[PDB]
Design a protein around this ligand. Structure first.
Ligand SMILES: [Zn+2]
Ligand SMILES: [Zn+2]
Length: 87
């Protein structure tokens, strides 16, 4: 699941009603585990579920798993710091 393309392949049967969708999820390191709206990061193994209207997969990645190596080398530490400045 190291590549954006491989992670996308898991999202073929992502539920239609979820207000967050595969392109943003897979970009943020997530792949679909095949149950409900549950996804996991390929790097930190953090899982997220219960996605809401307005959620951004990067923000949620930084909110819950700020020590993720993938996240730090993609968005940088300042981005992560800013997420926690206001939550
Ligand atoms: Zn991660
Ligand atoms: Zn915080």
């Amino acid at each position: 699941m190291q590549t954006h393309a491989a992670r996308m392949r898991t999202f073929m049967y992502w539920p239609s009603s979820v207000p967050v969708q595969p392109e943003q999820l897979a970009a943020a390191g997530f792949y679909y585990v095949g149950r409900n709206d549950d996804v996991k990061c390929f790097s930190c193994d953090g899982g997220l579920r219960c996605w809401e209207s307005g959620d951004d997969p990067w923000v949620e990645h930084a909110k819950w798993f700020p020590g993720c190596e993938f996240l730090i080398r993609m968005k940088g530490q300042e981005y992560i710091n800013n997420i926690h400045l206001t939550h």
